[PDB]
Design a protein around this motif. Structure first.
Motif, PDB file in Angstrom:
ATOM      1  N   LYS A  45       0.832  -1.197   0.000  1.00  0.00           N
ATOM      2  CA  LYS A  45       0.000   0.000   0.000  1.00  0.00           C
ATOM      3  C   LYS A  45       0.867   1.248   0.000  1.00  0.00           C
ATOM      4  O   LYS A  45       1.922   1.268   0.622  1.00  0.00           O
ATOM      5  CB  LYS A  45      -0.926   0.007   1.216  1.00  0.00           C
ATOM      6  CG  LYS A  45      -2.155   0.894   1.059  1.00  0.00           C
ATOM      7  CD  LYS A  45      -3.210   0.570   2.114  1.00  0.00           C
ATOM      8  CE  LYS A  45      -3.713  -0.867   1.993  1.00  0.00           C
ATOM      9  NZ  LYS A  45      -4.570  -1.142   0.807  1.00  0.00           N
ATOM     10  N   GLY A  46       0.421   2.282  -0.705  1.00  0.00           N
ATOM     11  CA  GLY A  46       1.184   3.510  -0.809  1.00  0.00           C
ATOM     12  C   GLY A  46       0.259   4.694  -0.959  1.00  0.00           C
ATOM     13  O   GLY A  46      -0.895   4.643  -0.523  1.00  0.00           O
ATOM     14  N   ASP A  47       0.766   5.763  -1.568  1.00  0.00           N
ATOM     15  CA  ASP A  47      -0.040   6.967  -1.791  1.00  0.00           C
ATOM     16  C   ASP A  47      -0.276   7.295  -3.266  1.00  0.00           C
ATOM     17  O   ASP A  47      -1.266   7.933  -3.602  1.00  0.00           O
ATOM     18  CB  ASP A  47       0.550   8.172  -1.052  1.00  0.00           C
ATOM     19  CG  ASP A  47       2.055   8.200  -1.105  1.00  0.00           C
ATOM     20  OD1 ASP A  47       2.630   7.461  -1.932  1.00  0.00           O
ATOM     21  OD2 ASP A  47       2.657   8.963  -0.324  1.00  0.00           O
ATOM     22  N   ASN A  48       0.624   6.857  -4.140  1.00  0.00           N
ATOM     23  CA  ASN A  48       0.458   7.069  -5.583  1.00  0.00           C
ATOM     24  C   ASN A  48       0.590   8.520  -6.044  1.00  0.00           C
ATOM     25  O   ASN A  48       0.246   8.855  -7.182  1.00  0.00           O
ATOM     26  CB  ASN A  48      -0.883   6.519  -6.067  1.00  0.00           C
ATOM     27  CG  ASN A  48      -0.953   5.022  -5.967  1.00  0.00           C
ATOM     28  OD1 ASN A  48      -0.122   4.412  -5.294  1.00  0.00           O
ATOM     29  ND2 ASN A  48      -1.939   4.412  -6.626  1.00  0.00           N
ATOM     30  N   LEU A  49       1.068   9.387  -5.159  1.00  0.00           N
ATOM     31  CA  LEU A  49       1.359  10.767  -5.531  1.00  0.00           C
ATOM     32  C   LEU A  49       2.835  10.953  -5.935  1.00  0.00           C
ATOM     33  O   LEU A  49       3.741  10.351  -5.349  1.00  0.00           O
ATOM     34  CB  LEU A  49       0.919  11.725  -4.416  1.00  0.00           C
ATOM     35  CG  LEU A  49       0.723  11.148  -3.003  1.00  0.00           C
ATOM     36  CD1 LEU A  49       2.006  11.182  -2.189  1.00  0.00           C
ATOM     37  CD2 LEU A  49      -0.370  11.914  -2.264  1.00  0.00           C
ATOM     38  N   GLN A  51       6.417  11.339  -6.424  1.00  0.00           N
ATOM     39  CA  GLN A  51       7.522  11.603  -5.509  1.00  0.00           C
ATOM     40  C   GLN A  51       8.688  12.374  -6.102  1.00  0.00           C
ATOM     41  O   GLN A  51       8.841  12.493  -7.324  1.00  0.00           O
ATOM     42  CB  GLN A  51       8.025  10.305  -4.871  1.00  0.00           C
ATOM     43  CG  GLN A  51       7.048   9.688  -3.911  1.00  0.00           C
ATOM     44  CD  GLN A  51       6.513  10.693  -2.916  1.00  0.00           C
ATOM     45  OE1 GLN A  51       6.364  11.876  -3.218  1.00  0.00           O
ATOM     46  NE2 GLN A  51       6.232  10.228  -1.712  1.00  0.00           N
ATOM     47  N   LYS A  58       7.228   6.405   2.453  1.00  0.00           N
ATOM     48  CA  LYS A  58       6.512   5.482   3.311  1.00  0.00           C
ATOM     49  C   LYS A  58       5.681   4.533   2.455  1.00  0.00           C
ATOM     50  O   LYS A  58       4.944   4.972   1.561  1.00  0.00           O
ATOM     51  CB  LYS A  58       5.597   6.256   4.252  1.00  0.00           C
ATOM     52  CG  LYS A  58       5.791   5.927   5.708  1.00  0.00           C
ATOM     53  CD  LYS A  58       5.016   6.909   6.567  1.00  0.00           C
ATOM     54  CE  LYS A  58       5.611   7.020   7.959  1.00  0.00           C
ATOM     55  NZ  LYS A  58       7.072   7.291   7.880  1.00  0.00           N
TER      56      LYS A  58
ATOM     57  N   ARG B  11       1.320  17.685   1.126  1.00  0.00           N
ATOM     58  CA  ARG B  11       2.072  16.441   0.906  1.00  0.00           C
ATOM     59  C   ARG B  11       2.892  15.847   2.055  1.00  0.00           C
ATOM     60  O   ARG B  11       3.137  16.500   3.070  1.00  0.00           O
ATOM     61  CB  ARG B  11       2.960  16.568  -0.317  1.00  0.00           C
ATOM     62  CG  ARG B  11       2.502  15.728  -1.443  1.00  0.00           C
ATOM     63  CD  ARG B  11       2.834  16.420  -2.731  1.00  0.00           C
ATOM     64  NE  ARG B  11       2.803  15.493  -3.838  1.00  0.00           N
ATOM     65  CZ  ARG B  11       3.367  14.295  -3.789  1.00  0.00           C
ATOM     66  NH1 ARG B  11       4.013  13.894  -2.691  1.00  0.00           N
ATOM     67  NH2 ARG B  11       3.287  13.499  -4.842  1.00  0.00           N
ATOM     68  N   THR B  12       3.325  14.599   1.843  1.00  0.00           N
ATOM     69  CA  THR B  12       3.980  13.761   2.858  1.00  0.00           C
ATOM     70  C   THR B  12       5.044  14.487   3.695  1.00  0.00           C
ATOM     71  O   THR B  12       4.776  14.907   4.823  1.00  0.00           O
ATOM     72  CB  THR B  12       4.587  12.452   2.217  1.00  0.00           C
ATOM     73  OG1 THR B  12       4.739  12.625   0.799  1.00  0.00           O
ATOM     74  CG2 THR B  12       3.696  11.223   2.485  1.00  0.00           C
TER      75      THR B  12
END
Lengths: 63, 50
Positions: A45-49, A51, A58, B11-12
């Motif tokens: 599982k991740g965020d898909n935004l 990077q 994470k 964002r993160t």
């Protein structure tokens, strides 16, 4: 009602029979394909935004 | 006046950014940051981290 469980992956056979008066046996078998899948679970599982390079990341791990 | 504004980063981790505003005939700016380059009239490059 039969309850399929991971074991029977990917393909299980059903054989069955009856006996008349302890002398006759008659039977039949049908073969079935169970969905060729994971016995258990595993997903990353991740965020898909989008990077950015060498940046801090994470990822969750479900299994 | 003192125009307030706020930059949000959803964002993160952290993230840096520039906010420059174009000046106009009728608004003194207090800095001579007018810096026109390749057709463009804008403010110095901040350089904030959020």
């Amino acid at each position: 009602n039969l309850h399929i469980t991971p074991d029977l992956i990917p393909s299980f056979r059903f054989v069955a029979y009856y006996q008349v008066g302890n002398n006759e046996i008659v039977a039949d078998s049908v073969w079935v394909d169970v969905k060729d899948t994971c016995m258990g679970t595993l997903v990353v599982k991740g965020d898909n935004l989008i990077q950015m390079p060498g940046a801090a990341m994470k990822i969750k791990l479900e299994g | 006046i003192q125009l307030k504004g706020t930059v949000y980063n959803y964002r993160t981790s952290g993230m840096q950014f520039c906010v420059k505003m174009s000046a106009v005939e009728g608004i003194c700016t207090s800095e001579s940051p007018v810096i026109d380059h390749q057709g463009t009239k804008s403010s110095k490059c901040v350089r904030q981290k959020v």
